[PDB]
Amino acid sequence: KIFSMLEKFGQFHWFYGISIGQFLSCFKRVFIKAARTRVDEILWLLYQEVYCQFSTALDKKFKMIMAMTMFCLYKFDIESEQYKEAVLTMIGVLSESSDGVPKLDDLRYLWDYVTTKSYISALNWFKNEFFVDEWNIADVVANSENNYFTMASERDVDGTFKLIELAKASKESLKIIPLGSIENLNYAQEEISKSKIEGGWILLQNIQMSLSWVKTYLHKHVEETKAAEEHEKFKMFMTCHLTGDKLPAPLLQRTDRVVYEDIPGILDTVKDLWGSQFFTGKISGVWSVYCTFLLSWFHALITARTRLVPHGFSKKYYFNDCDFQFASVYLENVLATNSTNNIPWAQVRDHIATIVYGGKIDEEKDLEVVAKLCAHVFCGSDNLQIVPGVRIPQPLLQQSEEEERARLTAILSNTIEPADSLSSWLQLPRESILDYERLQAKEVASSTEQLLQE
Amino acid sequence: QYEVIKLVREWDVIQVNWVEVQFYWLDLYGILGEIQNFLPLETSKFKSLTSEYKMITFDTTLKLTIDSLKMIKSSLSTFLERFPRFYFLGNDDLLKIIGHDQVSKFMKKMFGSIESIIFFEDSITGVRSVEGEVLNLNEKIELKDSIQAQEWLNILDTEIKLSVFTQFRDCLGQLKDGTDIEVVVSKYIFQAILLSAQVMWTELVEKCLQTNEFSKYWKEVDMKIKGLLDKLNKSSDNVKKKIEALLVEYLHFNNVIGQLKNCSTKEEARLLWAKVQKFYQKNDTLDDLNSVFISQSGYLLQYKFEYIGIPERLIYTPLLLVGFATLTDSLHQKYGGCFFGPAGTGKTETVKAFGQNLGRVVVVFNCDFDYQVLSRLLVGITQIGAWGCFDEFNRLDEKVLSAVSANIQQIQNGLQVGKSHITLLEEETPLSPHTAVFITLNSELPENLKKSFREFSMKSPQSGTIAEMILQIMGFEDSKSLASKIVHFLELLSSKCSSMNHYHFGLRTLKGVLRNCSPLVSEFGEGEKTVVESLKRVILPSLGDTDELVFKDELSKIFDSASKAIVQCLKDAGQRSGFSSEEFLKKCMQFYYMQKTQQALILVGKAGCGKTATWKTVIDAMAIFDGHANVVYVIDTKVLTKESLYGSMLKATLEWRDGLFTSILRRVNDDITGTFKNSRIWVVFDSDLDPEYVEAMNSVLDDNKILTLPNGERLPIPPNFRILFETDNLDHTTPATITRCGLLWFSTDVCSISSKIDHLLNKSYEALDFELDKLKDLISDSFDMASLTNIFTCSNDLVHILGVRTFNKLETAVQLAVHLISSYRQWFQNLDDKSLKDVITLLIKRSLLYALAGDSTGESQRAFIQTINTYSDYSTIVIKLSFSSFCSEIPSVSLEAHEVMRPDIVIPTIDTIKHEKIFYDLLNSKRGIILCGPPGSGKTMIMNNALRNSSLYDVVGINFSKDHILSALHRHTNYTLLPKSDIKNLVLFCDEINLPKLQNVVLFLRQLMEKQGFWKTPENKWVTIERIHIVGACNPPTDPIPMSERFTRHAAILYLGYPSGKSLSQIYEIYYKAIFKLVPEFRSYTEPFARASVHLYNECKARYSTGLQSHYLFSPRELTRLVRGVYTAINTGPRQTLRSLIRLWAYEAWRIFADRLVKEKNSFEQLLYETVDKYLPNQDLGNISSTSLLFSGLLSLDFKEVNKTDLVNFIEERFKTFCDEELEVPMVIHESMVDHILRIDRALKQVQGHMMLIGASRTGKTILTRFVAWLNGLKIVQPKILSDFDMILKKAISDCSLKESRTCLIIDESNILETAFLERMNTLLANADIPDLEEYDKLLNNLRNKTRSLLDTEQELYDWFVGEIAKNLHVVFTICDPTNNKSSAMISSPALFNRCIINWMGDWDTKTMSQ
Ligand SMILES: Nc1ncnc2c1ncn2[C@@H]1O[C@H](COP(=O)(O)OP(=O)(O)OP(=O)(O)O)[C@@H](O)[C@H]1O
Ligand SMILES: Nc1ncnc2c1ncn2[C@@H]1O[C@H](COP(=O)(O)OP(=O)(O)O)[C@@H](O)[C@H]1O
Ligand SMILES: Nc1ncnc2c1ncn2[C@@H]1O[C@H](COP(=O)(O)OP(=O)(O)O)[C@@H](O)[C@H]1O
Ligand SMILES: Nc1ncnc2c1ncn2[C@@H]1O[C@H](COP(=O)(O)OP(=O)(O)O)[C@@H](O)[C@H]1O
Ligand SMILES: [Mg+2]
């Protein structure tokens, strides 16, 4: 039954298929490592090992669906019938397909979660009360004998720095080699050859950029060979994108697949933007660092809003570091060419909301919301609240670049992000995010019902 | 080997590459060789290649030619460095340019703005723009013989740049000294005046911006606008273009200043001034070419000072300036600009305008155009430094998309890094820092290309402001209200009308309306009237009837406003040519106005609406109106190939041979007789709109008006040479040609059914040769339109095979009635008026019957006879004139016993005589005839019978397939083309007309029938046909390829139904009498066998329908097969009795009918017993079971019923002999196999017996066929499986014919792999053989030798060869598992189904599996 559920998972998307040898290896890993008896302890260990092996190959929705389906499959054979009736009643309430009070100790907390409209808490109820283990990236790479890893993610989200952190924690040198041109293809070929003959990690960015290499070169590379040379701490990585064109399926089948989720910490991404900026230019620090701070905040609130597809925007847009760079150079130019310090913030607002950040956008309401965000960020007033928690003072006329940089870093550091960062900080109604959570819950529960009805 | 002297005579004798080198050298010596000192390095290469060419003129020689080609390519690559504009030109174009004395017309490709070079006494003085503007150099360049081509090209380019700079400096000096623009506009080019006006505007706005005042310079620029608008009408054409393209910029200046004046705060004004483009001038730098830079939203770009001429200038809108600022922001950091959105938003035009505004000519690419031209153009742009505009970039092919995306990524990487050299096309090319790359999109950009660009989305621009300022340019009093009205109308037109694929109402059609309004506003005056008339003349021709109603209603709603000589001329032209209405008048006026305003139209509508009548009558009205001598050409495009249409040059030699369209254009351009001063020449292309055929005239249809030929020649199209396209639908048409060319849409018929009936009769009398006037009045009075309209409307209720409208069959009716009445001319002088009226009415009645009821069933024919008679069944006229019946004309025939097996013998029944007589009547009317019906009904048979027994027509034997007729016709006709006989006409028997797949040959038949002639492809001449007719026979709706109505409309359609039960009984009664003359003692039983046969046939037809199994089709051909089998049994048997006869009939009926069955065999046994009991109550009949009826001649010298034991013992002995001599298979021998092999042997003994076997795998069909073939002494042939199939078929035919080898061909389902093989065996099995599959002459002479060893004309020779190849050839088709699509196509194919006998071996039953 669980193999049928995983095959139905593979039916939904190209990246979610499984093989059979992987399933058998995961099954034997149950025994290679008392629930009132010994056979039920074996069954519990089997479920936990299978879930921790096949949970990291999915996004949040598919892994949460798998967790709740596995819990239902456990309970519907060990627990009594009224438990199944209550579970289906509450799931039907979750998907807005069935109505009725459940027949009533952990289910009391589940009902409290459901009546409070905290749907991710209802999923955490499954994932915590049943499963007592979770696997991260290091757990996946440590607990696999394979040498190929596919780490896919949505656009405007990258986990290359995560692999860099892992390599630094593993005392192993990571080589980052992007693709995009035939020179990049030649560099990738020579680098992967040097790695295969000598050693050292290689990570390729966006092989989907070289999907031609996927069908011809990579297919002849990975499929036409056995397991590589058993070097010490030597592995090969690869990343892709979930929302684009499908890659070759056998290459997916011959490698361990990992799906990396986002890091939508708004204060965290403000810190990430601020700490990677080496401030230099004609305007040292009198206003360039302040404008870069405002631009880092603006890029943070605009790259976090694009994660909420039906509510934050009207379409899944993608904003990246190049947009930040062009906005930065525009701010540098307008600040350099207007030294009277009566800075025309209207010019910056219009040029950001029409050309720099309004270029790729098509709909009018999304232009409106980007204009609203830029007006809130680049208002250029004496005192402004970038969020309801932080107030930013304008630079005074008696500081250097170092003092202002330290002051802005201190203003960033003492901030603590609240738990409603996706609601309070992006200036969104709580009703809209509650409706988005409800729609997510309905989709998840309907998928669970469709899985369990077959 | 030919004769060498450059020029080569009789080239059709490595040689291909050699003569390609010969042609390239012919061009090279004709341009450089025979103009030479203008390229010294190329002269040295010319001498070296001359040595090599004289050496060759063979592997070393071929290597030398390849090295010479590489040397020429390397010489061009060296011409890149020192010049880089040849990349807009091909290799031969570059060679002829380096070959400016007497050379021009290529500078438009490499520059983009100039048209011709002005010369004076071997010295360059200036260049002329495309739009006629005159450029004057600062210093005249003296041209000498020894200067290199690149040298004077470079000095000309630098002189153009410096002259533009000097004229701009002088213009700015004049403007700053108070001289007004309308004095300096008459001296210098438009670019210099434009740049000076822009710089002066920027300076004045900036100077008045330092304080708060705007009204002074606003009033100044308003007065300057008014002055230019007043000076516009009093200027020449080039000055008119200058004033217009400057007044648009002055409107832009007024718009910007008016927006700045309305700003409440100075900060808002500074914002808006930063948003608008600015033009400054540096007065410190000494370098002249960089003295002007570009300011937009703070960023800076540099001018390049390239000549632009006076191109079409985009109207300045806020969206346009936002796009300009986006491109500025992208190009500041050396990126590129990417545009996307819906189509018709102005992406290519905003890129062109942004490049134009900086004084640099952008390079625009269109996509649909291979990789090589893209790479060459990119290299040229990156070397020059121009800008890259990839239009329809999403439409490019994926491989070239990846290649050009890699190239663009390399360009952008070089621009970001600032590389001095770029590595493109495997060469280190210099990369200028002034280059740019722009892409426009309608999907999205690839991500590797998306990362390096700035995607920007535009909507439809402010068409209101565009139209307002365009109307303001031409001088309308109320531009804004008219612009709002017209843009509102275009929006409502795109919203309310139907979603037809050619209804385009974007900005391009609005621009076309504004462009076309100019001659009309000059002729009628400004206001709402001129714009509404231009809107009508542009939009009305392309709308449908309800579309026209919506158009009329809305146009009357929004707009206030609501030549009799040309009406008289159209009426006179229609009366002279015999044509004959409100809709016809409206379409005539519409076409008149398009041909007044547009130079190229397409004609489209339903088939037979009067498109040819419309354009012919308007051309005749043009002849009588304008006084011009009119010549008209009508061309069928698809009958000829595209290469034959537009000039066939053999790629082997690259030698030009003229085409018919090429010859027409050469005659037009030459103008030998000088009659072209008052001659308008029309070429009408009357076929469907193939995009491949029509895209060769893309420049011809557009404003270029120049014909592009493959060899490089450029023949111009004069304004009086207009091209028409007659088609039926807009399915396979791109919107580019739809908006590019005017479209006239015939939504419905023009009616005039009363007026239509006269033109047919009048041209019928005109085509011929006291009583004539009387007969004309009688026919006209009998043609009462009141009754005829009701009859025509009631005729639609009948079912029509090959459904053609009632308006499109009146040609057949009128022609047949007139021919029948003319045929009785000599017997009209001695009869009363009443009998004449009755005879004329009856003949018209017959013609109307055979026209409006031909394509219907016999029951439907009788129903229409009854209804029309109330508005006889077999009425006729016999030789005074009297009324008689068809039944009295039936003759009697008594054939021999052995004359049954001849397939060419028919038995004349009532329907046979009726069909033969009407076939003669329609054939003598010179009208095409198509007979439709179920297979086996007798279409081909009745045509062969009607054609062989007549002394007025001859037979041409042509066989068709999926893939000619005129090839055999060349051997029967004489060249005008005439029949070889001087008495009998010739008629084209074209069988299996559904077989060609979609079609050229059907349009060739339409050309032969409609225009009565064809164009000779190798001679490019028109030949007229005198006495050739065309006939055919198929059933389209039951074919497992429907035809265009444009072909079947010109031919008469009659339905040929199955013979009735009484007719079948009579004909096979005569057949039974013929075969019973062999045994005369049983001649009294002829009627019961005939009635039993026809009853069994109709019972099997009703019972075993095709709804059960696909191959369950029964046709009266099976009855002829049964009679032939009975004759072969009787002739090869001993003295029989009544029991022997009834058992033979039962066995043969079982074999013919039941062998297709797999329960069904038990049902057939019951049916056979029932028929025997009902019709033949004879004593001890029996022998109706499968195992009770065993007939064979394998045991003795004669055919007789056998016992089981001797048969099985003999077959076991023969099978053990087979195993000891042939291949050994462990076969178990059972009763069903014995029954099967008995039926196979009885099928194989029959002359021309072919067969196909259906059954499950490992049932043993092939092994039993091989065994019976060895038993029957035939020669086995196994296909060792298109060229191989063709050669094995030819080997089989040749071995069967020249050696008299009786062959059995076993073709399995695994042998066929493509539809070509299926078509080949379909052709081979339809008739006796396929002669299509010096070899023909060798076969003919060997045929003559064989015939003389064992007839003079080719007809009798061909018939004898066909009989010989039919008698000694048998083919067996092994097919299994009919569920396969290929197997089902093979079984259901009409050609293979009819000739072969269907055998379903089926699956094993319980009993047979038991033993
Ligand atoms: N006043 C009229 N009203 C209707 N039909 C007319 C009239 N005058 C002539 N006709 C006939 O109508 C026919 C219409 O033929 P038309 O050219 O429209 O046919 P088609 O199949 O659409 O195209 P084409 O013949 O160019 O291949 C003319 O051939 C002519 O004989
Ligand atoms: N400023 C303007 N004034 C008038 N017409 C314009 C202007 N800008 C764009 N257009 C119209 O836009 C059309 C260009 O179509 P476009 O959207 O570029 O399609 P494509 O990208 O396929 O070439 C032109 O036909 C022109 O009529
Ligand atoms: N009136 C008739 N008299 C004799 N035979 C007929 C008649 N009508 C049809 N047939 C039979 O129909 C068959 C011809 O049908 P068809 O397939 O149209 O011609 P063909 O067999 O030459 O292609 C002949 O075999 C003939 O025996
Ligand atoms: N009496 C039999 N009936 C059916 N199949 C047989 C019999 N005897 C032998 N066979 C098998 O049938 C094979 C030949 O069958 P064949 O006619 O080639 O198949 P198909 O009917 O698919 O063409 C032999 O290889 C043999 O093994
Ligand atoms: Mg035939």
PDB file of C-alpha atoms in Angstrom, chain B residues 96-191:
ATOM      1  CA  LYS B  96      29.585  41.685 -57.513  1.00  0.00           C
ATOM      2  CA  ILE B  97      29.917  44.718 -55.223  1.00  0.00           C
ATOM      3  CA  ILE B  98      33.718  44.494 -55.171  1.00  0.00           C
ATOM      4  CA  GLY B  99      33.359  44.179 -58.933  1.00  0.00           C
ATOM      5  CA  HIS B 100      30.689  52.989 -58.063  1.00  0.00           C
ATOM      6  CA  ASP B 101      30.480  52.644 -61.837  1.00  0.00           C
ATOM      7  CA  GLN B 102      27.200  50.999 -62.942  1.00  0.00           C
ATOM      8  CA  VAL B 103      26.683  49.195 -59.603  1.00  0.00           C
ATOM      9  CA  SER B 104      23.941  50.004 -57.077  1.00  0.00           C
ATOM     10  CA  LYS B 105      20.874  48.584 -55.275  1.00  0.00           C
ATOM     11  CA  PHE B 106      22.884  46.689 -52.651  1.00  0.00           C
ATOM     12  CA  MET B 107      23.635  49.633 -50.356  1.00  0.00           C
ATOM     13  CA  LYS B 108      20.132  49.357 -48.896  1.00  0.00           C
ATOM     14  CA  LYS B 109      21.071  45.983 -47.410  1.00  0.00           C
ATOM     15  CA  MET B 110      24.335  47.120 -45.811  1.00  0.00           C
ATOM     16  CA  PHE B 111      23.458  50.718 -44.838  1.00  0.00           C
ATOM     17  CA  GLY B 112      19.678  50.594 -44.449  1.00  0.00           C
ATOM     18  CA  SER B 113      18.868  54.230 -45.214  1.00  0.00           C
ATOM     19  CA  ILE B 114      20.351  55.082 -48.644  1.00  0.00           C
ATOM     20  CA  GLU B 115      19.085  54.073 -52.097  1.00  0.00           C
ATOM     21  CA  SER B 116      21.406  55.472 -54.781  1.00  0.00           C
ATOM     22  CA  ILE B 117      24.687  57.351 -55.098  1.00  0.00           C
ATOM     23  CA  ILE B 118      24.752  60.706 -56.901  1.00  0.00           C
ATOM     24  CA  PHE B 119      27.725  60.959 -59.264  1.00  0.00           C
ATOM     25  CA  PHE B 120      29.314  63.749 -61.301  1.00  0.00           C
ATOM     26  CA  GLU B 121      32.216  63.057 -63.702  1.00  0.00           C
ATOM     27  CA  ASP B 122      33.705  59.980 -61.986  1.00  0.00           C
ATOM     28  CA  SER B 123      33.535  61.592 -58.544  1.00  0.00           C
ATOM     29  CA  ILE B 124      31.306  60.903 -55.550  1.00  0.00           C
ATOM     30  CA  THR B 125      29.248  63.973 -54.630  1.00  0.00           C
ATOM     31  CA  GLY B 126      26.498  62.532 -52.443  1.00  0.00           C
ATOM     32  CA  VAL B 127      23.984  59.794 -51.728  1.00  0.00           C
ATOM     33  CA  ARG B 128      20.213  59.590 -52.119  1.00  0.00           C
ATOM     34  CA  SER B 129      17.956  58.285 -49.368  1.00  0.00           C
ATOM     35  CA  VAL B 130      15.343  55.567 -49.786  1.00  0.00           C
ATOM     36  CA  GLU B 131      12.654  58.250 -49.421  1.00  0.00           C
ATOM     37  CA  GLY B 132      14.329  60.541 -51.964  1.00  0.00           C
ATOM     38  CA  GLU B 133      16.208  62.905 -49.646  1.00  0.00           C
ATOM     39  CA  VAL B 134      19.383  64.309 -51.199  1.00  0.00           C
ATOM     40  CA  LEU B 135      22.636  64.246 -49.222  1.00  0.00           C
ATOM     41  CA  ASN B 136      25.554  66.487 -50.196  1.00  0.00           C
ATOM     42  CA  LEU B 137      29.111  65.672 -49.157  1.00  0.00           C
ATOM     43  CA  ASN B 138      31.282  68.357 -47.587  1.00  0.00           C
ATOM     44  CA  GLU B 139      34.003  67.581 -50.145  1.00  0.00           C
ATOM     45  CA  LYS B 140      33.466  65.630 -53.350  1.00  0.00           C
ATOM     46  CA  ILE B 141      35.391  62.351 -53.305  1.00  0.00           C
ATOM     47  CA  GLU B 142      37.408  62.008 -56.505  1.00  0.00           C
ATOM     48  CA  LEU B 143      37.191  58.422 -57.756  1.00  0.00           C
ATOM     49  CA  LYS B 144      40.201  56.854 -59.471  1.00  0.00           C
ATOM     50  CA  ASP B 145      40.705  53.456 -61.072  1.00  0.00           C
ATOM     51  CA  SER B 146      43.357  52.243 -58.626  1.00  0.00           C
ATOM     52  CA  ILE B 147      41.439  52.916 -55.388  1.00  0.00           C
ATOM     53  CA  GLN B 148      40.261  49.784 -53.592  1.00  0.00           C
ATOM     54  CA  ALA B 149      36.566  49.074 -53.073  1.00  0.00           C
ATOM     55  CA  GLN B 150      36.910  49.072 -49.283  1.00  0.00           C
ATOM     56  CA  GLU B 151      38.981  52.268 -49.474  1.00  0.00           C
ATOM     57  CA  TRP B 152      36.348  54.393 -51.200  1.00  0.00           C
ATOM     58  CA  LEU B 153      33.561  52.731 -49.205  1.00  0.00           C
ATOM     59  CA  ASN B 154      35.362  53.754 -46.004  1.00  0.00           C
ATOM     60  CA  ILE B 155      36.025  57.288 -47.241  1.00  0.00           C
ATOM     61  CA  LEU B 156      32.348  57.560 -48.215  1.00  0.00           C
ATOM     62  CA  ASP B 157      31.191  56.370 -44.789  1.00  0.00           C
ATOM     63  CA  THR B 158      33.548  58.758 -42.983  1.00  0.00           C
ATOM     64  CA  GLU B 159      32.499  61.589 -45.309  1.00  0.00           C
ATOM     65  CA  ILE B 160      28.833  60.843 -44.559  1.00  0.00           C
ATOM     66  CA  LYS B 161      29.545  60.967 -40.820  1.00  0.00           C
ATOM     67  CA  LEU B 162      31.547  64.200 -41.047  1.00  0.00           C
ATOM     68  CA  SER B 163      28.996  65.774 -43.404  1.00  0.00           C
ATOM     69  CA  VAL B 164      26.154  64.986 -41.003  1.00  0.00           C
ATOM     70  CA  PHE B 165      28.236  66.532 -38.211  1.00  0.00           C
ATOM     71  CA  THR B 166      29.016  69.636 -40.292  1.00  0.00           C
ATOM     72  CA  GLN B 167      25.402  70.121 -41.374  1.00  0.00           C
ATOM     73  CA  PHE B 168      24.242  69.683 -37.776  1.00  0.00           C
ATOM     74  CA  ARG B 169      26.759  72.277 -36.574  1.00  0.00           C
ATOM     75  CA  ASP B 170      25.653  74.700 -39.294  1.00  0.00           C
ATOM     76  CA  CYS B 171      21.977  74.059 -38.488  1.00  0.00           C
ATOM     77  CA  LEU B 172      22.566  74.740 -34.793  1.00  0.00           C
ATOM     78  CA  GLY B 173      24.496  77.897 -35.653  1.00  0.00           C
ATOM     79  CA  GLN B 174      21.630  79.089 -37.842  1.00  0.00           C
ATOM     80  CA  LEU B 175      19.056  78.293 -35.142  1.00  0.00           C
ATOM     81  CA  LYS B 176      20.991  80.090 -32.395  1.00  0.00           C
ATOM     82  CA  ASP B 177      21.318  83.152 -34.677  1.00  0.00           C
ATOM     83  CA  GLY B 178      17.535  83.544 -34.818  1.00  0.00           C
ATOM     84  CA  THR B 179      16.922  81.988 -38.236  1.00  0.00           C
ATOM     85  CA  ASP B 180      13.625  80.106 -38.225  1.00  0.00           C
ATOM     86  CA  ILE B 181      13.360  76.407 -39.032  1.00  0.00           C
ATOM     87  CA  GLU B 182      11.437  76.889 -42.302  1.00  0.00           C
ATOM     88  CA  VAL B 183      14.501  78.516 -43.889  1.00  0.00           C
ATOM     89  CA  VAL B 184      17.083  75.934 -42.796  1.00  0.00           C
ATOM     90  CA  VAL B 185      14.730  73.041 -43.623  1.00  0.00           C
ATOM     91  CA  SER B 186      15.242  73.618 -47.370  1.00  0.00           C
ATOM     92  CA  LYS B 187      19.048  73.218 -47.349  1.00  0.00           C
ATOM     93  CA  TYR B 188      20.377  70.340 -45.228  1.00  0.00           C
ATOM     94  CA  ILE B 189      19.295  66.760 -44.618  1.00  0.00           C
ATOM     95  CA  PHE B 190      16.573  65.844 -42.139  1.00  0.00           C
ATOM     96  CA  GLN B 191      18.946  64.264 -39.599  1.00  0.00           C
TER      97      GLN B 191
END
